[PDB]
Amino acid sequence: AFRVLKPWWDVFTDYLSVAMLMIGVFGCTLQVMQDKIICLPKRVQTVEMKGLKTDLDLQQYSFINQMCYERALHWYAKYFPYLVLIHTLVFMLCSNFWFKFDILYAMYVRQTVLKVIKFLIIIAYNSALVSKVQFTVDCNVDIQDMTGYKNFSCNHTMAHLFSKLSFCYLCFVSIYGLTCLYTLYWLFYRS
């Protein structure tokens, strides 16, 4: 049993990585649902209101749905759980890297530094690209030849859920990086 040589930071990171995998599985299940985006045209042809007749079939609506999923929605907004799953696989692979490997000190600080830089890169990229998960999307695909409308407004059904999942994911990686930075401080504070 290596639990004696497993301090609190390693066990905390293990449980956090399990949480990462659970979050990624939940996000993949969210992406499993067929109904992803819902698109309606713009400028479509007490006061009584009347519904606007878009003059569109079901399959035309589905076509605009997938087209605006293609060319208007952000790639991170479409594969955020995908990146989450890949990156937690990387986390559990390189979390036991020192265990699965002055050479002892060397590979231990190598593991800590690799974990720290992965954490920092994840923080930078997530903080940069998290704002792109929006509900109201403006889509300007050129399918006027088939539908008749050149501009569309769409809604991403689970965009709020992806933003909340990204907030929880960022909190988890934040605790991860705080405990790993404490590990690095303890390692490099003394010889």
């Binding site: 698109c39 209101m49 059904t157 929880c168």
Partner: protein, 197 residues
């Protein structure tokens, strides 16, 4: 293992309460991921952003397609449904997971007794925050939901009156959840006093 002598009846009771809270969270998340939606019909005759609510009977033609209806349902599901009514299963999942981490803290972490003392303070203060936030927001879930998203440029109407089908379920789930939390907290509260005396 042989830790049942180190696990007294309050730790086992809180563990079982946590298991029930976990499967409640799983049930809520499953319901929200599969069958959760809203069903919105526009208010045909409106009086200042308010539904006035007024030879045989014929169905009202809104002339909205099924897709426009889907758009209205999603848009009203975000901007007007109360956030607790949408994030209750994820909130209870997060609370259950943090309770599990707190209750199983010494099992993989007189310093042990002081650690349990700090653990009990943290767990009981989280119980206090949990019960306050849950009690204050249980009555903020309603079946019939008003909506004023101002999407007249896409469907032609402003105000909508939607139905949230599983909303009551969440309230009922939340209701049961309150009992569990209270039990958990009450049990934990005794432990604090049991170590205070």
């Amino acid at each position: 293992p042989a830790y049942r002598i180190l696990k007294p009846w309050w730790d086992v009771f809180t563990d079982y309460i946590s298991i029930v809270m976990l499967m409640i969270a799983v049930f809520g998340g499953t319901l929200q991921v599969t069958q959760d939606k809203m069903i919105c019909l526009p208010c045909k005759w409106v009086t200042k952003d308010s539904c006035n609510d007024s030879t045989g009977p014929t169905g009202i033609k809104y002339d909205l397609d099924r897709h426009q209806y889907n758009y209205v349902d999603a848009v009203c599901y975000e901007n007007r449904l109360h956030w607790f009514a949408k994030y209750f299963p994820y909130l209870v999942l997060l609370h259950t997971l943090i309770f599990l981490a707190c209750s199983n803290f010494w099992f993989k972490f007189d310093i042990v007794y002081r650690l349990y003392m700090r653990q009990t303070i943290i767990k009981v203060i989280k119980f206090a925050l949990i019960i306050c936030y849950t009690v204050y927001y249980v009555h903020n879930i309603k079946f019939d939901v008003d909506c004023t998203v101002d999407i007249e440029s896409l469907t032609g109407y402003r105000t909508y009156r939607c139905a949230h089908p599983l909303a009551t379920l969440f309230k009922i789930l939340a209701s049961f959840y309150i009992s569990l939390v209270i039990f958990y907290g009450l049990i934990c509260m005794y432990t604090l006093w049991w170590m205070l005396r």
